[PDB]
Design a protein around this ligand. Structure first.
Ligand code: HEM
Ligand code: HEM
Lengths: 145, 145
């Protein structure tokens, strides 16, 4: 279950998540757009899912894309803040899960975000250990899809 | 015009929003649920819009309501963080506006949140001065509906 997936996040993982978020989370507009734009360049098949955002190739200049990207980073902020309380983490994860379930996004497709996260982390010198920690957090969401 | 409304956020208004947010934003779960239990208590006619959350009268015990409430507080956090840049505040406001336009929520009904905000602020010893500052922030979203 989602609860089991959340309850598994260890102290070392939470530590790595929080330490890395201190940095990548400090510039939500910049890192959010980079994270999201990287998803398109590496997984072109997903572009169609974001038609509401207009021409996503416009990057930062696209106000809809910018608003979406900044807001996505606050979803992650939400997750990071609820780490010490699985019950709260679970209810916010399920809330965001519905938003994707309605868009027909499968657990496998949601996992496509791992590549982008790993790359953004690397641009800030956070290695594989940190990428693995984030994959574990993403896995919590996947348990809900 | 969302741009004209954003212009209404002067130095003094932004300061009050920040000062008050430091207090109410420190407990997103508690204050977030307080907002909704108040909204549904004072304006029962709005309950229908929230069918997905189930029995809202359950308050904190309702996982869907709690997840919803926490998430809402992060939208306000988003707004507060974008006060320095009107162009970024506008794009995040329009993003959330769409979420309500799709649910057929009008500017007038969105404004019903002012009552709960004033009550929650009052409970923390923040008077009309602060309630009015927040009413101006809500006005920015109303301009986009
Ligand atoms: C770190 C992981 C992710 C987070 C935290 C996240 C967060 C969000 C948030 C907050 C929204 C706005 C929900 C709404 O207002 O309706 C959203 C929308 C959406 N997401 Fe994600 N998402 C993630 C990954 C993905 C991935 C991997 C895909 C694609 C395979 C995806 C597809 C979508 C779609 C199609 C929408 C609707 C966009 C629109 O039309 O506004 N998301 N996401
Ligand atoms: C401070 C003002 C408010 C903010 C910042 C706000 C924020 C949000 C956010 C972030 C969501 C989740 C979006 C999504 O995932 O689709 C949401 C959903 C919603 N909001 Fe608001 N909202 C506010 C006031 C209101 C008011 C006053 C009403 C009704 C009169 C309203 C009606 C809705 C409805 C119907 C939903 C969908 C709930 C669901 O089925 O999950 N909102 N709002």
């Amino acid at each position: 279950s989602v609860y089991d997936a959340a309850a598994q996040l260890t102290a070392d993982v939470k530590k790595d998540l929080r330490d890395s978020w201190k940095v990548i989370g400090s510039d939500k507009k910049g890192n959010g757009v980079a994270l999201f734009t990287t998803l398109f360049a590496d997984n072109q098949e997903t572009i169609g899912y974001f038609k509401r955002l207009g021409d996503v190739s416009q990057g930062m200049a696209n106000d809809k894309l910018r608003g979406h990207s900044i807001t996505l980073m606050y979803a992650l902020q939400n997750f990071i803040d609820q780490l010490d309380n699985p019950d709260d983490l679970v209810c916010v994860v399920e809330k965001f899960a519905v938003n994707h379930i309605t868009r027909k996004i499968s657990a496998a497709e949601f996992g496509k975000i791992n590549g982008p996260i790993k790359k953004v982390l690397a641009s800030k010198n956070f290695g594989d250990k940190y990428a693995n920690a984030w994959a574990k957090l993403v896995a919590v969401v996947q348990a809900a899809l």
